[PDB]
Amino acid sequence: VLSEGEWQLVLHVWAKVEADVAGHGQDIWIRLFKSHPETLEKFDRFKHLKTEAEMKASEDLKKHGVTVLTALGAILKKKGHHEAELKPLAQSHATKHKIPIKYLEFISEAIIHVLHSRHPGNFGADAQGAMNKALELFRKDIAAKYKELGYQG
């Protein structure tokens, strides 16, 4: 359980991210694919991209980034009361896409790296600690759902 003070730090920096959802989406997925190439293999729709240049020019990848950040933003705004939002996400990622928990850890790392680079003034040590706590809560609850659904993860 996070304290109200910790949620405030998380939503304060997220408000800045919302000023340019598409741009943040691009930086995050590009950071992930470059740092962990194996994650790209899970997208039959993007597995052909060979360079950072091709990724940055992809309109479809940009669109998907917006979809992903909008879904994550809705969860964070619930401040822990996200049971209803997690069910459909857990089902599709465990049963259809087959995404291991380890890959959710990799994208959490990419999110923190991008926020640190673009928002240093609003992402100091205390704020980073609060964001890590929020993302750990997310992964913990998704993992529990994965188990109930029959996927090891």
d(CA 45, CA 110): 21
Shortest approach of ligand HEM to residue 134 CB, angstroms? 12
Place of tokens 């039959």: 44
Buried b / exposed e across 10-32, counting CB within 10 Å, b at 16+? Answer: beebbeebeeebeebbbbbbbbb
Of 107, 114, 131, 134, the one binding ligand HEM by CB under 6 A: 107
Give the residue with the Cβ less far from ligand HEM, 5 or 133.
133
Q: Which of 30, 22, 68 is nearest to 46 (CA)?
A: 30
The DSSP call for residue 97 is S
Residues 37-96 that bind ligand HEM (CB under 6 A): 39, 42-43, 45, 67-68, 71-72, 89, 92-93
Shortest approach of ligand HEM to residue 51 CB, angstroms? 19
Give the residue with the Cβ less far from ligand HEM, 72 or 130.
72
Shortest approach of ligand HEM to residue 96 CB, angstroms? 7
How many Cα atoms within 13 Å fall on the side-chain side of residue 47? 7
Chain position whose Cβ is nearest to ligand HEM: 92
How many residues of this chain bind ligand HEM (CB under 6 A)? 16
- Do 131 and 112 meet the contact criterion of CB atoms below 8 Å apart? yes
Point out the annotated binding site for nitrite. Answer: 64
Q: Which residues bind ligand HEM (CB under 6 A)?
A: 39, 42-43, 45, 67-68, 71-72, 89, 92-93, 97, 99, 103-104, 107
